[PDB]
Amino acid sequence: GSGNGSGGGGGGGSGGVGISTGTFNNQTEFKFLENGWVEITANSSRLVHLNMPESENYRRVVVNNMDKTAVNGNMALDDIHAQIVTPWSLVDANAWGVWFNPGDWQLIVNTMSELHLVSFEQEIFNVVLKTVSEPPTKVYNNDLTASLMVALDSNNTMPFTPAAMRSETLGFYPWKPTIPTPWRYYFQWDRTLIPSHTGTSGTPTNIYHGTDPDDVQFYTIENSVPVHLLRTGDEFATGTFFFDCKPCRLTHTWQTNRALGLPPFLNSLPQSEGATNFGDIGVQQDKRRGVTQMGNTNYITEATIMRPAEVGYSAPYYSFEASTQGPFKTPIAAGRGGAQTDENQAADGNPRYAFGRQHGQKTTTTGETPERFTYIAHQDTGRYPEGDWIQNINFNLPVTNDNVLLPTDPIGGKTGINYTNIFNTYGPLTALNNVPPVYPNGQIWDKEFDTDLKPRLHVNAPFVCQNNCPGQLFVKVAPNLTNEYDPDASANMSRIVTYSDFWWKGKLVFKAKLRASHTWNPIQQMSINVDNQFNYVPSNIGGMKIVYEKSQLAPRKLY
Amino acid sequence: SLPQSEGATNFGDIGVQQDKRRGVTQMGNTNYITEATIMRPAEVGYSAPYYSFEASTQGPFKTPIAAGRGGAQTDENQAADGNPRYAFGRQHGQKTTTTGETPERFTYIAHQDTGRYPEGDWIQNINFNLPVTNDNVLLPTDPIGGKTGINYTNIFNTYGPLTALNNVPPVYPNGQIWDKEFDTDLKPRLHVNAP
Amino acid sequence: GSGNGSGGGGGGGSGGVGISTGTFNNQTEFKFLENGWVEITANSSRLVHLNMPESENYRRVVVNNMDKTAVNGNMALDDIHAQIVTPWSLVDANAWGVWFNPGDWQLIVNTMSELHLVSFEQEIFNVVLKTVSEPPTKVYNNDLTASLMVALDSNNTMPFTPAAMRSETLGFYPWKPTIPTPWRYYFQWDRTLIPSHTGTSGTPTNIYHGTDPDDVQFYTIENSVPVHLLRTGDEFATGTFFFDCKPCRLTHTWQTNRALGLPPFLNSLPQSEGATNFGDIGVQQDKRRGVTQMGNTNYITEATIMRPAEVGYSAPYYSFEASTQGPFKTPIAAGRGGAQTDENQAADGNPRYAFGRQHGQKTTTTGETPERFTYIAHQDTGRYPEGDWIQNINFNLPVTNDNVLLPTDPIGGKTGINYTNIFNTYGPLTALNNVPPVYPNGQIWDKEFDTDLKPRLHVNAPFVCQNNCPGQLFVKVAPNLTNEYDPDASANMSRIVTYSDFWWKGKLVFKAKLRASHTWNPIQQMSINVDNQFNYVPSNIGGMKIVYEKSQLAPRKLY
Amino acid sequence: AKLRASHTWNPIQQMSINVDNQFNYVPSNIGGMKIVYEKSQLAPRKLY
DNA sequence: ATACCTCTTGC
DNA sequence: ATACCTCTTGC
DNA sequence: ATACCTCTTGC
DNA sequence: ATACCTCTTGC
DNA sequence: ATACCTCTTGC
Ligand SMILES: [Mg+2]
Ligand SMILES: [Mg+2]
Ligand SMILES: [Mg+2]
Ligand SMILES: [Mg+2]
Ligand SMILES: [Mg+2]
Ligand SMILES: [Mg+2]
Ligand SMILES: [Mg+2]
Ligand SMILES: [Mg+2]
Fold first, then answer.
1. CA of A412 to C1' of I5 (A)
2. Strand C5-10 relative to strand A5-10: parallel, antiparallel, unpaired?
3. CA A513 → C1' G3, Å?
4. Number of domains in chain C
5. Closest residue in C to D15 (Cα–Cα)
6. Which structural domain, as residue segments, surrounds residue C391?
7. Which of B49, B65, C12, C539 is the most exposed place for a label (fewest CB within 10 A)?
8. Is there a contact between D5 and C104 if contact means CB atoms under 8 Å apart?
């Protein structure tokens, strides 16, 4: 029935028991420079809460949903894999929402034309630790001398696990607390699994072989980073980090192979208004002057005519490939979009995000179903397979069935397939763009692969750091023991129930550039209205939510 | 959900409905999120036709690969496309005393797990309604062009802007060490004969 | 039902109540220098836990398992001895495992050729003390003003008790806490005990005489070291210590007397492959040219021929000798090894380690039986007695039974004995090596004897400090009293239940040298594989273990 | 070239001799010689 | 033109 | 802030 | 350590 | 006080 | 008197 004793505070220049060590700031600054450059500084802070780990051990676990895949035709459902599980927790902040609110986004997006990522740093403070002790009256006392541990993997020794890919970054609301996630990482494993269908006879091999001892790697924080111990008075801070990576644009393109170059001169123009009064080239398709890449005909049509190269490309879908560890969907860059979609035509390439209350779902809404959406980029660089086709070289037309392959004809005798599903047109002439950011649920920057050769882009984030990326930040509560402890014993050790709270504050800097009017007509711009109006404000209860928004609004020539 | 005792059957469990999990995919239609669905930043390795022979002005020739294969599902017998094979005489490794003019040989199987296991591949209809119907899926089993011993994986290709991979590794002692680059305007990102 | 009061923290430059005083680091550094020297720096930290002593007294206890020895034929089982028991606890860290993990070991061992011990220092911090107070609800409160005591025997006044000899050093896992052991030391005593056998009639004298007052020595910390008192804010640190001792090699030898020098020229060579096509010297054994140490014959054989000196030596076993205080096994240097062993032939010289979870045994395994092993060095410098023999000087052969003594003939009329059991061949020509390290359970360095003349080596560790060795570190909880205390009273004093936790961190430095290829064939190297693969990783539960590994892998000429 | 350094807790793969291959590295009683092939990228590295 | 199984008892 | 059982590997 | 809804009544 | 799996983007 | 959709490859 004691308060513990209240203990007394000694005082240095950067801290003590009853001395704050930090300052809260989650404010965003725009600073206009000469020539239309802007320096955007975004501050962000949060109160973070964290419990002691389940157990102070590292574990090696295997996951096995064999049963589900055992089904036949449920290949895609495979979740098998191995992983190391640590006692540490990770503080990840890589995600649009952590840093900006809508108002901000708006601005950026409407007035700028390109954006560069500059630097970033973070710090922790006002640390606090309390212990619970318990008729179920729970009491809480500060444990003045206990500690919080912190480690920053600046060397990037640990494997990299961006958490946004699972919606586990921090929260997006400055005024409400949040937490870090428990850290874990992939551990190697061999695995086989033969695809099958409903109609498939017997049991296609489906097994977990084990682990290529060659491929083994087991890391630990303890052995690789220096751990800091903070007490309340303590505080920690990373330096400032600078990024090396390309800029990101905020404009989208729209021309496709069809709109490149000099359109054909029309010998004949309409003479009155009306949406049926077309113009006419006025020349026999087989009599026109110009250039093609087709040696046989004399036809020259908007679809035949030569273009300098090729925007976009086509690839297989839905493709699953498989290697040593099981199958996985083959990614695309492009996505699709347009008039012939409307989220329902929604296909391959468009990404889809799913998430919780901490990241956008309405706070007050009950029921644990995740909120979702499919981002549909503005950039018209994807494909409409249905429109594709292939024909015989003789090119005698109108064309015969025997000389043409359609998205309609079935391949391999399977009805619901056609060449477009296994087609691929990437090649030296291909040209395209990087994905666009996705607010607020998009990852912001990402690490590059350590392969000898490399992707030309990643699909999860727009900024890929060329060199090293900022090291991960882990934390964890220091074990607080009871008076009984026998390491020699097999049992798990008992600890005092302990937990901690601390504030975290970060600063992320971008640099961008104002855009300027070039066309006569105005352009698209994000804006509020009666329809969405409520998405941007709390409910009479404090309901909040963050809807997704687009990024590359304005157009730009492609050529 | 974690296991509570040792034993190679005590798996852990995510503990969430596959169609209820949070996260990201590159698939606009479902709500499924599985280790195979989930989005990855890009793609290691690629898949290519085999055994492919192409032909130009001077005759046909095998189309080369970078990757090779390897792993648990091989053991030199599964040995396929990509793995290189060296053959040679006494001056270069074959036992000096051994008589008989048959060359000694081997197939180098790299350690780097960057190749493909075609059998495992598959393709399905966009509607992605599953478990899947035969009509909506193409397998390494179904025969293409009406030829039994063929399937899409033989003419498939997945190289693309997202692809990522490594250079071959050296091969002692029979590997070439360095090599000249082609005088074309555009160039290979690597050669397969030397590092 | 109070929290004690929580007390308030004052602040100096090196500490306070809510100020951390240390940094956790258990990381290992390799720093490559010019000429292939490396500086290996190994850091290591632990959370140490410690309870108040059973009693604040020094006691003088005698141990007596008379009964067991009383048996007859159970001489070896004698455990008698005297000892002082202190209230202090000892922090010992002298043991391979404290400092390196396997990964490390690997490296070292595969790429280096010799290793030197350089310096070492340690420190303690983030001290904490709590008190337990108690329906059995135990509550824990910090006692802000209580203290921890610490003493460092830099003068080496206390008798030296390396704890690894009993597996009581600290733990080997950075991520799990551990503890110090209770300190005690031998106290002199006189004792007699006549060996006997099963078949032995009556009661062989078997007694504890007492104590040669001459030989008496009783030390106390208090009277010999300065004790520091740390409070939470306090922290302590030893200087840095430098070792003076020989290097240790990481290569083993293999030639025996048989492989020294110029082999005999073969006048006749094989002409085809096959493991039966031997070569032939081609000269009558009694007609060859060369040198022996045998004046009588003319025989010259690989076993007769003279060698420059003698590798290895032979000694009695199993020998027990006895002096003033009872019997004890006579130690050997060599051990044995090879083809004719396989842990089952395992004899005299090979050492055997036994230990708990804190030191390698599987953490999850239940049941208090110790894990064990017998280290079998790679260096081929031991003997195979069975092979030995002795013969009459006349050397007329083939030899007669009357002229030869075998490992088979029984000595003293005892069946199960032969000369080799009491044999000894050490002598001026003998040559040999130091023991090799034993990871992870081996002691690392050891003190030298204060005798006028000295051992040429120790068997428990490879590094013996020539001068002084780093002083022992003791700690102990300061008595925390109740309000009642009467020193004048005979009863034991009552104390508040108190205990403490603190982190300890050390740094140990070696310096080594890279090795280089010299032979055509590759050599042995430690490596992982399917078979051992799991020894190096945690179980799905957090099971851990550390298997033993070898040290002198590569070979080296001996001559 | 550049020396490598330990980073994981577990040791890694390493080329080594043993009873099985032992003879590949030495001449026969006749002078038989041979050179077997060996691997090159033994150790692992994160890819990401 | 020999230095402790390389270069290198060099520099 | 460890030197050969003190102070004191100081001075 | 408050300046006209940011940074910034700074520089 | 984060740099490309150590020390060490140090010196 | 042409520089990457302005002024402005200026200053
Ligand atoms: Mg650093
Ligand atoms: Mg570094
Ligand atoms: Mg393997
Ligand atoms: Mg592998
Ligand atoms: Mg002193
Ligand atoms: Mg002294
Ligand atoms: Mg006497
Ligand atoms: Mg005496």
1. 49
2. parallel
3. 29
4. 1
5. C525
6. 1-559
7. C12
8. no
